[PDB]
Design a binder for this molecule. Structure first.
Ligand code: GDE
Ligand code: FE
Ligand code: FE
Lengths: 405, 407
């Protein structure tokens, strides 16, 4: 319920790479690292429970299917493979509950989202994180990653990133739980990493954009992709994610820190923002917001024989829904039947999940949090005609249940 | 550029799974009184609104996933690759619709090369002659109706409201049909599994056609209670109705409830426009192009727009698999055997084989696929940059404040 502040930081893989090579001591990289030191410190003192983390994936985990606002709702995240292997970093915990709360308020505010789990985080996330948080086995905090689809145009408008940040603030604030949340906007600043114009930077624009972001962010909201990429480089236009983190903060903020270094392709920059509360008590109340947020599933509880597939359910059921979803592959539905206890043994399903499938436990799996269309897959794959399932749901068997027409 | 009108139709899987009989015979040709209209009007494209049933959209799942690619094969739903011919898509129209939508502040998703499940194909091989190919091209709007929160009914409606005039402003004078696939009242889960309700179905069908704005307050509860949980997907129907005239003509209307799902059907015929729209079709086209207007004035810069992604897809998809240690190992060891197995045209092979960095960018490869390719080959980003600038690596490193290297 408590937004403590927000920070902005580049997510260049060079950060990740200078870190892993331990060039902390090296003449080029050394002062760039003390650039992060105030944010690193501020994070270790404030000790937020969760960092709501805004980044973009770089056609690693997001390519053939590519969304604008992709809220990670899973309980855990590992480093992606970007063609060199995963980096040596412990997985970092998610926060499905808060993700669920945010998901709800954001849809109430007519933002069309996407939800995702299981998939790695590429340099977009773990590059500056590996440097801002100690991780020699556990990350100090949890994350709710929002990956943004900023590479494939048309992408959302600048004003739309800002307005997302705005609703985002009040969702986070209205979360009825006593936690500290930090907000990160990552990417930028100036840089262009493709075509004959590769190499482009613009320190003048970088410094203008940051002071405006800090002290007059509504002034940026009219900026087109063309504006932002003419001043900032094509890939520099990803700084709209900075606009979103800024939109999640108090109108006025205390800029505790700013740093800037431009050794190579990327203007490596860092801002820390201290949140300053709400001046006036806001136009919708915390409780009215919580109301309007689950207004769509208000009363849904009193419809029994009904297990709505919401995010908590989806997370609870993620392992088994994913295993049963893998039936659409040929060599998986084929050993689903030729070697179940071999497919089971190499799985990461709990024993309870194996036996639920084993028993052909139809309403058991629905109860557990298995979505039916995964069963619809299982029944067809095991040859079991679909309305054997609908019968076992209600208690009846095929012939007695059949009676309705 | 002109919408001929929409058809609502259940995308029940048993319409197809078995079918391709005295009980189905009445619905079966309760289907052709919209089939007629598909054959005599012959729309150039059909904007098809359905939902994937956790086949193609699952681990990463979105609310309005616009299909932007050129061909769509049937999705293997576990019951194997259903024998149907690859239907064509419409990237040019898909691109244009995205721009109007994003300008009207609808957050989208884009996708390519993934199968359509029964939600599309099952009722398609039933409304459309699919002999050797399909009469029209398709723009598939895959909706995300299974995992709450999901967009409001209001939101579904307004999408269709934007969708309509996004299609009206498409500068090509072609004709577009609008499929509002889905429904009706059923429930295929829980022990409510078998719930139906037709004193609702009928009132829903009647109000959808003549007073649709009275459906813009139905919560999921109000919906799932009146129609079953999975029945609540009919907000998709509202989206489709969104894209048509405020006043319409019920050319047809089927119904008959066999097993689980109320198999309905509602042929609409678009009338004119109520009054001339508030924004002009030129003014819309301008506003949809405003974000990137003048981007061609930026030199050495190749925006990765939807057309570029479609153009670059095979080679971008192929380069993407470098993230798998098995693929990327063959890539290094026996590249030609990978090439031969691939579906890469002969120039796409050569671009990659020649390490032609600048060519790949010109062609449509997005940089971050090259960034991987560099790493796979144990060379770095700098080399790629230098190659773009047509400079040696030390001469390019000179243009930077410091000289670092990385992967
Ligand atoms: O070469 C770089 O500095 C660079 C590479 C990236 O892939 C990237 O996202 C970035 O922000 C910077
Ligand atoms: Fe990025
Ligand atoms: Fe459906």
């Amino acid at each position: 319920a408590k937004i403590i502040g927000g920070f902005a930081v580049s997510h260049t893989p060079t950060i990740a790479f200078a870190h892993d090579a331990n060039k902390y001591d090296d003449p080029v990289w050394a002062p760039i690292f003390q650039g992060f030191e105030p944010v690193k410190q501020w994070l270790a003192e404030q000790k937020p429970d969760v960092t709501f983390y805004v980044y973009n994936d770089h056609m690693t985990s997001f390519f053939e299917h590519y969304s604008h606002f992709a809220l990670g709702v899973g309980e855990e995240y590992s480093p992606a493979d970007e063609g060199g292997g995963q980096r040596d970093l412990p997985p970092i915990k998610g926060d499905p509950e808060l993700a669920k709360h945010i998901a709800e308020c954001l849809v109430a505010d007519e933002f069309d989202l996407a939800y995702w789990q299981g998939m790695g985080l590429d340099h977009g996330a773990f590059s500056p994180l590996s440097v801002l948080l100690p991780h020699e086995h556990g990350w100090p905090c949890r994350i709710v990653p929002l990956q943004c689809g900023v590479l494939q145009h048309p992408i959302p408008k600048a004003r739309r990133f800002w307005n997302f940040g705005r609703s985002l603030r009040r969702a986070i604030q209205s979360y009825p739980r006593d936690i500290k949340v930090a907000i990160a906007g990552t990417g930028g600043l100036s840089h262009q990493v493709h075509g004959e114009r590769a190499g482009f930077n613009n320190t003048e624009w970088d410094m203008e954009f940051m002071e405006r972001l800090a002290n007059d962010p509504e002034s940026l909201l009219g900026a087109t992709v063309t504006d932002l990429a003419k001043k900032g480089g094509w890939e520099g236009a990803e700084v709209v994610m900075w606009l979103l983190m800024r939109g999640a903060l108090s109108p006025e903020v205390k800029t505790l820190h700013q740093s800037y270094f431009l050794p190579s392709m990327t203007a490596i920059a860092t801002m820390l923002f201290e949140d300053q509360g709400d001046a006036a008590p806001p136009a919708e109340s915390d409780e009215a917001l919580r109301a309007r947020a689950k207004r769509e599933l208000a009363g849904v509880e009193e419809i029994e024989g009904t297990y709505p597939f919401t995010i908590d359910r989806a997370v609870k059921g993620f392992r088994i829904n994913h295993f049963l979803h893998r039936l659409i592959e040929p060599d998986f539905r084929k050993r689903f039947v030729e070697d179940p206890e071999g497919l089971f043994a190499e799985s990461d399903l709990t024993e309870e999940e194996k036996s639920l499938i084993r028993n052909r436990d139809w309403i058991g799996m629905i109860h557990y949090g298995v979505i039916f269309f995964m069963l619809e897959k299982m029944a067809a794959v095991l040859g079991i005609g679909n309305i054997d399932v609908y019968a076992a749901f209600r208690g009846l068997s095929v012939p007695e249940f059949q009676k309705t027409r």
